[PDB]
């Protein structure tokens, strides 16, 4: 699902990207929606952070 998600995300980004080239030169309209979406990516700046692990799995097989 994770690998399926990456090839899928990649397709969406190509649409935007090919469009910008076409708007800049070849004069396709400039819409507020396209520009709004792009700007946000830079702004939010996600920061990697701790957590989400567990060690329980071994005890259960040993018991069995």
């Amino acid at each position: 699902n994770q690998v399926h998600g990456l090839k899928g995300l990649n397709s969406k980004l190509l649409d935007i990207r090919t469009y910008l080239e076409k708007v800049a030169s070849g004069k396709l309209p400039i819409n507020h929606h396209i520009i709004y979406q792009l700007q946000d990516v830079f702004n939010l700046l996600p920061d990697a952070s701790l957590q989400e692990f567990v060690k329980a799995f071994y005890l259960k097989t040993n018991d069995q």
């Binding site: 708007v23 800049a24 990516v41 702004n43």
Partner: protein
């Protein structure tokens, strides 16, 4: 310009450009956060303005060029990562 790449900027340059005092520039800037024209905070502990998000001014040709080159770098990144995720847990993936 400066917010985007790195979040914070000094508030001292903006007050002097205004040519109007410090105690009244904050007032308009607070009003701007409130409506949602710009989003972020004014931190007077260091007298700088930390901008969370900036509005992109609309129908500017220059901005379209700017986002394009960035977008291509992201595309690379997805491909690079995808090979690694499949490498380990490949037996499990099938």
């Amino acid at each position: 310009t400066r917010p985007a790449n790195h979040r914070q900027l000094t508030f001292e340059e903006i007050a002097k450009s205004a040519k109007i005092t410090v105690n009244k520039v904050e007032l308009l800037v607070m009003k701007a956060l409130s409506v949602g024209l710009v989003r972020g905070s004014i931190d007077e502990v260091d007298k700088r303005v930390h901008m969370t998000w900036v509005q992109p001014r609309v129908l500017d040709l220059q901005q379209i060029k700017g986002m394009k080159d960035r977008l291509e770098l992201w595309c690379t990144d997805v491909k690079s990562m995808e090979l690694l995720v499949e490498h380990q847990a490949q037996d499990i993936l099938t």
